[model samples]
Target: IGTGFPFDPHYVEVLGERMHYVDVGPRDGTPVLFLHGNPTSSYLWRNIIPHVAPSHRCIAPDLIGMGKSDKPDLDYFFDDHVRYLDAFIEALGLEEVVLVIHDWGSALGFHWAKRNPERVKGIACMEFIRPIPTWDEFHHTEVAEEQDHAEAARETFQAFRTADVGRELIIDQNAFIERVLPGGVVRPLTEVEMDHYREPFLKPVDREPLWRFPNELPIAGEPANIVALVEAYMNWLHQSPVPKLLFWGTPGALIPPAEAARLAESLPNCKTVDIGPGLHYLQEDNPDLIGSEIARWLPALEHHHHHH
Candidate 1:
């Protein structure tokens, strides 16, 4: 089992919630924040933290409902999550941030960057789906059985995140997270890394965010307002000016490669990478290669020529 790293818990009030984030490394190091995705916490970046801390400051936060962060008894929608993120970033007074983000992190962090483009110095994105109308391109699974199964899984997530099992599924391996993790990407997790993934579920409370993820997905005809909110959120991407480097797990189960190519074509400053032996958890699957590449790219991207 991968031994868990030590944490110094810091709390700050954000939008009436106590937000939890790991504020580590030299106080003055450049902030290279690594935001996480579904079924993972700030711990997702545990393996990469040691490598980057020496050169850049790293801030990894558990989304409000996930990880060690506070889980209030409120509707855990994507917009709510973004609201918390906005307040947290503002509270910290972050400037010139380089975001290493993935999955839902892409939407949350990217939206935040769009809101404050001047603060974003560079971005390395993975497994991200934009809020654009392009969602249909990837979500269209023709297999009836597969669509039903996926919908069922999403419903279970909704129930668990709200009711009893939500906590258990997160901290302990249920059929869903366990089965999906091994096949979701190319590189398989070692026993140690798998343990690190399981570490958060050590407590029942850890599952709260796990459950909330499925429940929050605005797939079907929602409360109407939720759909409108998502529309507004997706529209934000069209106006964002932040420079980005897109990384996709080729043959990734969730995100199609065509999506990556499409994004590159749309954004001139954007580039895509298909690191071999990589997966959704590319940091764990191919840490040395991915880490080295990202660290090298950081300086080049950071030297923005758009000086006034």
Candidate 2:
């Protein structure tokens, strides 16, 4: 349990897109930006932020189309996510940022860091690891490969990402969270906190990311630009000596074990951590560990702020 986690939702119009971010803590708290991965939004950091916010400036943004941000029908890709993040950083004039990234957030956040290295002072990663997605590396299933299955899966993914699953998944409630919440540390979430997590996806359109999720997947006919994104990211990791930390979910169902194994060589400064056992949604499984670890890391990043 964290003490004071202040969440502020604001919009930054980027290339005409309405980007949303949660600005919490003191305006001058050492700028700690938290970025979430797929299916989950900025809500992922609700617990951790409070712990870090005491002496840190914590900010979490629902990457465009994913959280509280407006979802546009434009072709959404990792680069698009990075583009908006760049705009968000610029709009806020965030300097020497200590980035906390999870899931897909790792790839997109690091990709942006690659371009704006001077702007980044430190990084603490979780759940997500980034590297090139090789054609041979994927564990393609029959359903994943099938034209019909892929189509249907895409539709389902889209619906889930667009915020439309609120009623079916959260309103009456009894959906994916059932599987995601059965963790091995704190108490079950309060109804108010549950509402914060559940309320965002209340609209059918809010689930748009689920649809675009497959698009980010490097399978079948992934767009050239998309593949280029993974490739560029790999190059950046290999070339940039960006300071980083690798926080692993002891039993990460969300991020495949195989993928985590592949990233250490590329992310040179990375350090591994296990948050009890679970997958992507570590907050559900081990909230206290996350909060404590983040609290510990905040000061370290804060110290680095002066030198750079």
Candidate 3:
């Protein structure tokens, strides 16, 4: 945890590992769970949580093998993350959750919502989308002009998925945290915040989960389960009537603005919010802006409570 992070740490046993989380605000308030993705943890929301915690029951958990959570001896695949997350929700007895997700968190959150539709209330996410059946299908209308974009993404994924290359770059060099993180953010991270991220993966073995994400991108029919899950929930996204908020950032790494708008238009009851000039990690770039947007958008979701 960072020195300036205000929330008191808490822990629960989920799948035999100590899963760390920050549970704050009124216990009886609407439960809002914030889920982070690859190479980052609950610490990523340090700035955003404070803004939401005052009115909502904010819960931000470090996924298994990330942040203050215990890193057990496991492969840390997509299924592994979902399994631990499922158990974590069960252990905490959370219901009617409004999920806030980014990156891998977006996929995992959608999967959870698909499985347990009754438990989820609403969702807000950024920089992530479900995997399409083909790369051509993925480019869609918005990003059609950017043909080289898909190639660059594939190149990075292929490089990380390669055997020795992944270990050499991610585990040995700690490139995901040391390089990719800083590169993804629009603003530079302070030493203390950077140290908080680096501390968890100081040992080589602890970094295994970091590389597994890129290795499990569900491309080329590999990781078939993830592919199927993404497809299934993506269908649910179009059909389900849940209120959703989709946030998007700049072109350095993830979803483009027009693509995000198209996504929002595709899904029923989904709204789009632009955070303005950020890469993958928009929280680092404009926490107050993102947090305020979420805070403002939340009221609209309350009208849907009758469905639950």
Candidate 4:
């Protein structure tokens, strides 16, 4: 088992912010891009990268304020993240790549795919946000799953969604680093593993990025622009025939098995897998299961080629 990230870091300057990533593979391999959700960075994919790297390029970039990426004085919003991601993809000149996404990463990746579907070959998303649940709705289903995840999802987070309350819970309390990371993983994370996630936001001020992520979810549909953007991508993904791989846990966490079953019926050209038992942070417990599913799934994309 990997205790800490073994790969050397790589950085790219994007829109004046320094973005950190891990690019590993044979020099000429096809790109298998990984996008992680909030409260996580490229570090989330540390264990999973090896499975994909042997046959394809693995690129996992830390979102602007998360991971090792530079956090400058900037607004952290849905549009800001999408904007930075657009510039990051543009800067990389990445094309025809497969996207493996989770949580907020799904929102960013799905939006990117809609704008440049031609550049996307296949998409694999797990625990992604669909229907953009309101905080109360997300909270209800979360606690309904387990009563123990309070630190991450229940009270602190219930308050975390509110403006000033989160600063106290997340920044001063460090609940995200403290309770959130460990609560999501079915397997216990080593101190080494937890530290990597914690290191990025040890400062009270840096916690803003972590706080803003869930807050970015529009309540009462007020952030009309972001709601519209999410609406657009959700509709586009349904209509688009691009292949998707949905790797989920066994009747468990976030995208629960029941939800996965429903999406299988609705999503176009989608493949669904039961990756044994796990939780929201499936990568921690099921990296091998998830990675192998991905390795096996990538080949099929060639069969569904989009002709110009």
Write down the TM-score for model 2: 0.73
Better of 1 and 3 by lDDT: 3
- TM-score top scorer: 3
Spell out the clash pairs found in candidate 4.
none
Q: List all candidate RMSDs to the true structure.
A: 4.7, 6.3, 2.7, 2.6
Q: Residues 1-308, candidate 2, lDDT per residue (tens digit)?
A: 44233576677777687877777778867688888876667877877777787778888888887667877775566667777888888888777788888767877777777777877767777655433244333321233333343344345434444454633543234343333333312346556655665555666555545445544654433556666666676677667666676666543533444445555665676655676565456676666777677677666554545733
lDDT of 3 at 186: 80
Winner of 1 and 3 under TM-score: 3
lDDT, candidate 3, residue 221? 76
Error of 4 at 89 (Å): 1.3
**lDDT of each residue in 1-308, candidate 4, tens digit only:** 57778787889999988999898997676788899987899988888888888898899999988898988787688778888888887788776789999988999999899999988999999988655446454523433545454234545555877677878888898887888778778788988888888898888899877787777764447567667777889899988899989988854555666778888978998999888777788888788888888998887777756435
Clashing pairs in 1: 160-166, 161-211, 167-207, 171-201
Full candidate order by TM-score, most accurate first = 3, 4, 1, 2
Candidate 3: worst-modelled 10 consecutive residues by lDDT: 136-145
lDDT of 3 by residue, 1-308 (tens): 23377789999999888999999988878889999999999999988887787788899999999999998889999899999999999899987789999888888899999998987888888887567556544433345555576566556656788889988999999989998898788877889988988989999889999999887776667679778888888898789888888877765355777777787889888878877877788888888877887888776676746533
Worst 10 residues of 1 by lDDT: 131-140
